[PDB]
Design a protein around this nucleic acid. Structure first.
Ligand SMILES: [Mg+2]
Ligand SMILES: [Mg+2]
Ligand SMILES: [Mg+2]
Ligand SMILES: [Mg+2]
Ligand SMILES: [Mg+2]
Ligand SMILES: [Mg+2]
Ligand SMILES: [Mg+2]
Ligand SMILES: [Mg+2]
Ligand SMILES: [Mg+2]
Ligand SMILES: [Mg+2]
Ligand SMILES: [Mg+2]
Ligand SMILES: [Mg+2]
Ligand SMILES: [Mg+2]
Ligand SMILES: [Mg+2]
Ligand SMILES: [Mg+2]
Ligand SMILES: [Mg+2]
Ligand SMILES: [Mg+2]
Ligand SMILES: [Mg+2]
Ligand SMILES: [Mg+2]
Ligand SMILES: [Mg+2]
Lengths: 127, 58, 171, 222, 51, 159, 185
RNA sequence: GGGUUGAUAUGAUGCCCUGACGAGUAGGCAGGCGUGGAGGUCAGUGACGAAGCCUAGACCGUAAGGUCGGGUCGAACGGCC
RNA sequence: AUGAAGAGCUUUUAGUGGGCCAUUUUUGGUAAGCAGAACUGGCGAUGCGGGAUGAACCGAACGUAGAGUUAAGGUGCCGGA
């Protein structure tokens, strides 16, 4: 159902991890640039981690697209969902985390009626 | 504790970054330092010349 | 490289004081015409008041051997700069062409005297047309009647790295 | 305003005339080149017959290639390379031979390889790596309309007339060669021939005047 | 959108040059020369063969 | 101690000449300098009045003023990253006309003459100078000029 | 690599898209960039560039300046264009019947120009009356008349208004300003 | 550096075309991410489970970070200007 | 002659004001990986291939990737040839 798109290319599927997030627990994995005068990572010696830069950017045709080819749009109710009535081949709905189980039923029913794809049609389902 | 006294190292690179431009040349340069005995006459001569052209194409 | 012989003819540039200058000539052993013309001026600067800016080249021509299959005996007169000073040499080379003789001479000088192309000058190469004018025994040795000699201890080169029999040096 | 037939046909007719003109001009240029070669050949022959020597005309055109990278260049060579538009390794430019340019070349000799190009390599360069400076942009030529629009002032209509203004160094060589973007050449496909580049071609290297051996190198690089 | 190289792609070759059609028709890349009966003088040959 | 005075390092520069000491010939004083004239500066050491600083030796400038015994010259002086204009009041013994301007103006009037001469028939003067071109083809004869073969000479001491 | 002759990735150094967030000015820009794109007239480009300018590069233009400009020859029946504001000037006692196009008019300027029989015009009505700049006369105001320019280039022997809050005797009128006290500059 | 307001549809800071370029400490500038609180709005989420916490489970983004699922929990909390 | 990559102009402000190395010129000193100057180029601020190893030497300067060709240096094995 998705709109035709090219092969999706990423150029770096590996998460850029902070230097020594593997060595110290106080050092979190969220990327920080090394600003040190003698940093091997800042100086880009062979054999060190890679630094994020703009050349790794994704093609503007395939940016923000999930592997299904849809752009994700968060919804909390049927009125927010109905904005994607005429955009089913481009945008897929994601029900927000804080939505209740009984309202997820309504959102999923209306999305099935309108032909809208839902990325998480299994949250808070009992059986 | 001695130190380095003087070197002209890097000064040509620095100057030529935005450098050795000629200052510039204008038409009608300054009459500054020119002889006052000449300036005093040039004033009157220019006055008369302006008057003459005015009365000419009046 | 592999050498060639070039006839290079040069001429001080004409003037009103003296047109038609005297058209000097040289034989140059060189791998190409650019090096031939460089060496022409190198030597003509040593002999006469002229340089590439005040002179010109009227013709450069390749000289091929008239008899490339007759086995000649050559004598070569060499000037070479050593590390201490400068020396002269006479060497006898038995070969089939002037260019081959000069190649062999440059190699023998590089080998026995560590002299380089920049250090070597060729004064002249002359075919010894009469035997018994040869004076070097290492050439005179191959000028003997019905000469014949073997090549002992032959080594056959193997395409593989494993041989399944011991080889032989017979010949 | 149907205009899809009448004006289209008029444009096609106007193009037919330009192509006829180009065809006849190119035939003339071929007849000129072949005669210019044959006549100097026969002049050498006749001087040999008469016991004289034929001193061929010194060349009016060289092709210069940058052989050295951009690091560690003194200022005078750096400026001369910028003025010849050789801003990267293996960039090439045609140069008119004059006393004003030979000294430039003597200054930049350890950084370039230059010599005397042939019609074949000039033509191959302009046809494979042929780029024009149109409004400060590097436009592939790919058609004679660009050349007619940007050099039609100077009698030039075709890539062939351009090649002619280059090789038969004409009144408008400056404008043609400036229109031509610096040739962006690859490294030689067979190699440089020597083990070591930064000696003179005479001393076993690669830089300097390799008078007529530059065609081989350039064809390997193009 | 793409630089097609002449010296291959005869179509682009002919787009740039219409003379390329008759160049091949006449085989001007393999033109034969008129034979000549010129012989050098003796001074040239003896100077060349001189020592 | 150090020493940077007005006439420091002028020993050989403000030297007079060999066999040209004494007074100066009268052509220096009979020459005529108008405003706009280009003049080279070469200090005479025998006239201590009106001297230039050693910096302006061998410098060429333009006249901006004329007085009883002196001449006002403008010079361009490199000071760091720029040029500043400098006004000297120099006696004429340290001053001579530059011959470059005379040789340019002769060419000016010659080009004007050529243009007026060849406009009567329209033949495209092409008045611009050009560099020394490459030399054209020619033929060299061996008539009485047979090639003289040469060879490298051996090594001798010559002492 | 490249041996670069110029500085890479350098902005032009010229303003586009005026940084004023005024929507009416943005609309004037939308109109005049279209006209500059399609009319082949230099007037449109001049006006478009002028609409980008800052306040100090858009000085006010006095009606007396406009009167001078119309006292030129062949300029009496012209349309005066001021990319900026027009201010009043009581130092004139007559004003002609011209029409004046400007962004803003002061109340006094508008009243003077109207009382003289003229009309005050906007740059959008100027666009329909004169899309290529027919019979126009662009006036710019004085830029170096500002106070800040007095201090630009302060140094010895320039004569360039030192930066000073309180003026009077004993405020920068001593050593460095008179030979009796050391030196004079 | 240029093209493109034409009516009908969505964004003129938009879309599009063309060419070139891309190292960087100190330092400068720009565009963005995230936190506590304030005004406005989504008649936003929420005891049918908010926030927080854990999760070699998933997705988006060059990254800052954002989103989802599962577990735990119990009362509040977010998106946009 | 060649080239111009836009030319010219102004305002304001940051950091810096310990330097060091190589070729060549040169001063003191027996000399110094010493001290001090001149010109350029570099390190500092710079990773990459090579020099086994190295701030500076050779080569070459860096967005992310693919293919090809090469520089310097190399092709017995370690090691691609
Ligand atoms: Mg950690
Ligand atoms: Mg560091
Ligand atoms: Mg210091
Ligand atoms: Mg190969
Ligand atoms: Mg090599
Ligand atoms: Mg393309
Ligand atoms: Mg003297
Ligand atoms: Mg690059
Ligand atoms: Mg733009
Ligand atoms: Mg920083
Ligand atoms: Mg919860
Ligand atoms: Mg964990
Ligand atoms: Mg409770
Ligand atoms: Mg400062
Ligand atoms: Mg300071
Ligand atoms: Mg530091
Ligand atoms: Mg480096
Ligand atoms: Mg070197
Ligand atoms: Mg590879
Ligand atoms: Mg191997």
């Amino acid at each position: 159902a998705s709109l035709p798109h090219p092969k999706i290319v990423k150029k770096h599927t590996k998460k850029f991890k902070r230097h020594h997030s593997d060595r110290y627990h106080r050092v979190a994995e969220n990327w920080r640039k090394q600003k040190g005068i003698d940093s091997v990572v800042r100086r880009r010696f062979r054999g060190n981690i890679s630094q994020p830069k703009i050349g790794y950017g994704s093609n503007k045709k395939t940016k923000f697209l999930s592997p299904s080819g849809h752009k994700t749009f968060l919804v909390a109710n049927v009125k927010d969902l109905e904005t994607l009535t005429m955009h089913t081949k481009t945008y897929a709905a994601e029900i927000a985390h804080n939505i209740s189980a009984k309202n997820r039923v309504v959102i999923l029913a209306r999305a099935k009626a309108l032909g809208i794809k839902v990325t998480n049609p299994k949250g808070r389902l009992a059986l | 504790a001695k130190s380095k006294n003087h070197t002209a190292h890097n000064q040509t690179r620095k100057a030529h970054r935005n450098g050795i431009k000629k200052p510039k040349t204008y038409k009608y340069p300054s009459l500054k330092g020119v002889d006052p005995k000449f300036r005093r006459n040039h004033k009157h001569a220019l006055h008369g010349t302006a008057k003459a052209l005015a009365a000419a194409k009046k | 490289a592999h050498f060639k012989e070039y006839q290079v003819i040069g001429r001080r540039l004409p003037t009103e004081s003296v047109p038609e200058p005297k058209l000097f000539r040289m034989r140059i052993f060189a791998s190409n015409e650019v090096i031939a013309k460089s060496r022409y001026w190198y030597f003509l600067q040593k002999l006469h008041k002229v340089k590439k800016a005040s002179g010109e080249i009227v013709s450069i021509n390749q000289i091929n051997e008239a008899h490339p299959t007759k086995v000649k005996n050559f004598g070569v007169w060499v000037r070479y700069d050593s590390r201490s000073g400068t020396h002269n040499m006479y060497k006898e080379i038995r070969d089939v062409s002037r260019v081959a003789a000069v190649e062999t001479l440059y190699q023998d000088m590089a080998a026995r005297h560590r002299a380089r192309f920049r250090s070597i000058h060729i004064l002249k190469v002359a075919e010894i047309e009469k035997t018994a004018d040869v004076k070097r025994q290492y050439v005179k040795q191959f000028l003997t009647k019905d000469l014949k000699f073997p090549l002992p201890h032959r080594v056959q080169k193997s395409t593989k790295t494993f041989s399944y029999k011991r080889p032989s040096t017979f010949y | 305003a149907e205009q899809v037939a009448a004006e289209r046909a008029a444009r096609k007719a106007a193009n037919k005339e330009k192509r006829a003109i180009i065809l006849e001009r190119n035939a003339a240029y071929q007849k000129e080149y072949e005669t210019a070669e044959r006549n100097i050949i026969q002049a050498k022959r006749d001087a040999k017959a008469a016991g004289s020597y034929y001193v061929e005309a010194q060349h009016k055109l060289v092709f210069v290639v940058r052989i050295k990278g951009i690091n560690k260049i003194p200022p005078k060579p750096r400026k001369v390379l910028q003025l010849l538009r050789l801003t990267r390794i293996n960039s090439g430019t045609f140069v008119k031979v004059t006393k004003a340019t030979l000294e430039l070349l003597k200054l930049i000799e350890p950084y370039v390889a230059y010599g005397y190009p042939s019609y074949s390599t000039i033509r191959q360069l302009v046809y494979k790596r042929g780029f024009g400076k149109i409004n400060k942009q590097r436009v592939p030529l790919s058609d004679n309309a660009i050349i007619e629009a940007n050099l039609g002032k100077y009698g030039i209509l075709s890539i062939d007339d351009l090649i002619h203004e280059i090789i038969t160094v004409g009144p408008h060589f400056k404008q043609a060669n400036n229109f031509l973007w610096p040739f962006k050449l690859s490294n030689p496909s067979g190699g440089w021939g020597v083990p070591r580049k930064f000696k003179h071609f005479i001393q076993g290297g690669s830089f300097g005047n390799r008078e007529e051996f530059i065609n081989k190198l350039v064809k390997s690089m193009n | 959108v793409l630089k097609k190289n002449p010296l291959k792609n005869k179509q682009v070759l002919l787009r740039l040059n219409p003379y390329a059609k008759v160049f091949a028709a006449e085989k001007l890349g393999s033109k034969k020369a008129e034979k000549t009966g010129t012989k050098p003088a003796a001074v040239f040959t003896e100077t060349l063969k001189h020592d | 101690g150090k020493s940077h005075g007005y006439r420091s390092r002028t020993r050989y520069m403000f030297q007079r000449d060999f066999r040209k000491h004494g007074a100066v010939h009268l052509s220096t004083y009979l020459k005529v300098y108008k405003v706009g004239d280009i003049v080279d500066i070469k200090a005479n050491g025998s006239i201590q009045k009106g001297m230039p600083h050693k910096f302006y030796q061998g410098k060429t400038g333009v006249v901006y003023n004329v007085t009883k015994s002196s001449v006002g010259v403008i010079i361009n002086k490199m000071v760091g990253n720029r040029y500043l204009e400098k006004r000297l009041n120099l006696r004429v013994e340290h001053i001579k006309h530059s011959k470059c301007r005379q040789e340019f103006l002769e060419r000016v009037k010659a080009n004007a003459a050529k243009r007026a001469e060849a406009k009567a028939q329209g033949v495209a003067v092409q008045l611009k100078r050009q560099p020394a071109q490459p030399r054209e083809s020619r033929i060299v004869s061996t008539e009485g000029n047979v090639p003289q073969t040469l060879a490298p000479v051996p090594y001798e001491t010559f002492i | 690599g490249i041996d670069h002759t110029s500085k890479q990735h350098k902005r032009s150094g010229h303003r586009t898209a005026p940084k004023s967030d005024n929507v009416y000015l943005k609309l004037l820009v939308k109109l005049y960039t279209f006209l500059a794109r399609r009319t082949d007239a230099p007037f449109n480009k001049v006006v478009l560039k002028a609409l980008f300018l800052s306040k100090i590069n858009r000085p006010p233009v006095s009606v007396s300046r406009i009167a001078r400009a119309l006292k030129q020859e062949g300029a009496a029946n012209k349309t005066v264009v001021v990319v900026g504001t027009v201010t009043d000037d009581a130092r004139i006692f007559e004003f002609p019947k011209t029409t004046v196009a400007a962004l803003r008019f002061t109340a006094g300027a508008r009243a003077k120009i109207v009382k003289a029989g003229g009309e005050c015009i906007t740059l959008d009505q100027l666009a329909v009356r004169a899309p290529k700049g027919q019979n126009t006369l662009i006036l710019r105001g004085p830029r170096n008349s500002r106070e800040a320019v007095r201090h630009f280039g302060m140094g010895p022997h320039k004569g360039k208004a030192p930066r000073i809050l309180s003026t009077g005797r004993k405020f920068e009128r001593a050593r460095g300003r008179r030979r009796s006290k050391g030196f004079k500059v």
